[PDB]
């Protein structure tokens, strides 16, 4: 390892090619000494033609390198791109890499990897556009691997000229029946440590996904919100809930319904976390002009189910406000409001009954009975 790195100070400007050749001959022989050889060979004086051969020569053996080094090799591969060869080499790379085999040990090195990529595409634009084409153009095979999502996310997270392009690609992908749960499932289950950094991007996506039609799209957006809230940190959780609130309130029917289903998922998954962001959830009630009674049923279910967690009677606030809005709707000639108050009240009552509770339910139902009489 020592003598090799010392090579270029020693040799004159003549007998390089044969050394390059001989070294390439060692390179196919031994994988242990990929990195230092490549270091030297980037430093010596060679024909461009020899380089390209060595590029292909390393890339066939790309699976074989022990993990630690894999990063630095790609560094080489991705400094060693022209404008014109971009898409072949990228397509090959995209094919040949795995992320499946590798996995503190695995994850750290992968993280470094993705750093290297991030760097590469930050500091040279063409890699980005070619790379997406190398997923878009490989629409054919259903078998797409953990990698392709992660990379699309990353590029969305970075340079923002491409966002529309990514969005179009991701729609065409979803309708086409490529991109699906089990992919996203394994994505967020394995590569969380990468993705956590790039929440913002995920949601600037997810908002764009739900606004369209085609229930499979919208369900994909659902899964985004779900895992986003499941696996990240607090700030992300808050942004999730806020976004969902937005989705409900502004809303149209499909979107709304999905969003409410998601709400249900969030609360049943992790109520404890949802409780401290219940506050924004409550402010929906200021907006009911838009919502249909079915939706209302789910909405009050959510709110009440959150409310009568035993520890946050400190914030029985929501309980009082819901009692208030019940009171106001029931107190109306208009059947359109009457039904809302009725359903809300009864549904609330069902939830609190898992004897002050008994006093509440009795008073509630007697009032409802009297109004509906």
């Amino acid at each position: 390892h020592d003598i090799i790195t010392s090579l270029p100070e020693i040799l004159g400007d003549s007998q390089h090619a044969d050394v390059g050749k001989e070294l390439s001959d060692l390179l196919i022989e031994n994988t242990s000494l990929t990195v230092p050889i490549l270091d030297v060979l980037s430093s010596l004086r060679l024909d461009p033609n020899f380089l390209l051969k060595v590029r292909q020569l390393v890339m066939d053996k790309l699976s074989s390198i022990r993990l630690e080094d894999l990063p630095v090799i790609i560094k080489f591969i991705l400094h060693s791109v022209t404008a014109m060869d971009t898409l072949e080499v990228i397509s090959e790379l995209r094919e040949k890499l795995d992320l499946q085999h590798c996995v503190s040990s695995g994850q750290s090195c992968i993280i470094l990897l993705f750093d290297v990529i991030k760097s590469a595409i930050r500091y040279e634009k063409t890699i980005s556009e070619a790379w997406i084409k190398a997923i878009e153009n490989t629409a054919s095979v259903s078998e797409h691997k953990v990698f392709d999502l992660v990379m699309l996310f990353i590029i969305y997270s970075t340079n923002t000229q491409t966002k529309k392009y990514i969005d179009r690609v991701l729609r065409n992908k979803i309708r086409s029946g490529c991109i699906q749960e089990q992919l996203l499932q394994s994505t967020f289950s394995v590569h969380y440590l990468v993705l956590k950094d790039m929440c913002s991007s995920i949601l600037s996506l997810a908002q764009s996904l739900l606004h369209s039609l085609d229930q499979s799209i919208i369900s994909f957006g659902s899964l985004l919100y779900k895992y986003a809230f499941k696996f990240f940190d607090t700030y992300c959780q808050q942004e999730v809930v806020g976004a969902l609130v937005t989705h409900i309130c502004s809303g149209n029917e499909a979107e709304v319904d999905t969003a409410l289903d998601v709400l249900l998922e969030l609360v049943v998954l992790n109520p404890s976390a949802m409780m401290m962001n219940a506050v924004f959830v409550k402010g929906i009630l200021d907006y009911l002009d838009n919502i249909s009674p079915q939706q209302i049923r789910k909405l009050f279910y959510v709110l009440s189910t959150l409310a009568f967690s035993k520890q946050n009677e400190a914030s029985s606030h929501i309980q009082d406000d819901m009692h208030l809005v019940i009171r106001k709707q029931l107190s109306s000639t208009v059947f359109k409001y009457k039904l809302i108050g009725i359903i809300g009240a009864v549904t609330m009552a069902g939830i609190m009954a898992a004897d002050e509770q008994c006093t509440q339910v009795t008073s509630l139902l007697q009032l409802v009975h009297s109004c509906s009489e």
Binding site: T234, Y235, Q238, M276, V279, A314, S315
Partner: protein, 370 residues
Amino acid sequence: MAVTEASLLRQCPLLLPQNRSKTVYEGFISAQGRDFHLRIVLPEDLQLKNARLLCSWQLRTILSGYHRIVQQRMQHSPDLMSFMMELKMLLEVALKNRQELYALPPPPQFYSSLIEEIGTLGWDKLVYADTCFSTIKLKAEDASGREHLITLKLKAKYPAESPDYFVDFPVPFCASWTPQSSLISIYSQFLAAIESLKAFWDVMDEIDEKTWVLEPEKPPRSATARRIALGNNVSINIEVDPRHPTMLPECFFLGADHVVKPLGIKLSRNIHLWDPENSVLQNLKDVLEIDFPARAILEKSDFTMDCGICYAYQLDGTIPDQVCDNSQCGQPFHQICLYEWLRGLLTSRQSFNIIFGECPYCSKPITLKM
């Protein structure tokens, strides 16, 4: 060999058939330099589904637990030769697990050579030796005049393998053990590492002397971090590089945001005046252009230094560090207490790693960065 006529001899030499009809085998089975008594009666034919196998009580105590596997293996295994090979492997595994049980040191080579070598060191050095003579501990002195210990743990075979070296100091200690080397060799290496790291000790000693070091209280020799207290209810925590101690350490400031700001500003503007020929304190003093208190009164100065929520010091390692940005409160807290507090309240809003809220005592804008 291929056939079970010589292969059996070669793989279990000490099983001698007693009977003419090779039906009674008797003798010893070998495993990690230990011969165990064994007697293996076959039926009239060569079948192991049913066979007798009696042992020494030594072998029973060593084949405790694995009773089910051998009974099972007798039925599943085709030949006797293979049964012996397989039985040996399992006995190997069993003893390899019971190495807390079967461990001994040879009297000749060992005890004498060790006494010679400790004499070769000198008896001013040795401080501790265990009654099993496995562990020993040695002492050395800095040129600065500090005592540093080194623990060695010795096996049955000391000169063959490396002895387990445990040392305090914070850089990873690397000991080139040879079979020819001895305690004096590693000792010289130990002093060498001490004299290399000499500067780091000198730095940390100057800090622990002339400053109110706070939270490595009674610091070990391994400890590289130093939370220094300065002024009142504000602190600077300092991490120092052992290889380059005199070089600038990573440092930042806890306390009141309105109080901390002129320290960071003054540091930033004057940091070029940092000079790595002086000491850390002698540099910091003209860099930050302030002095430290030298034990104002460090156990109780005049402040209920408890959390003012939990009213304790030392919650789970954590110190009162998060304070108010207010002259009238200045109330310290813990990260945990103040977090749980602010996360409850309705007024609080969370940015990325920050929560803004009202100080419990004075209801003024207080920031917490996780």
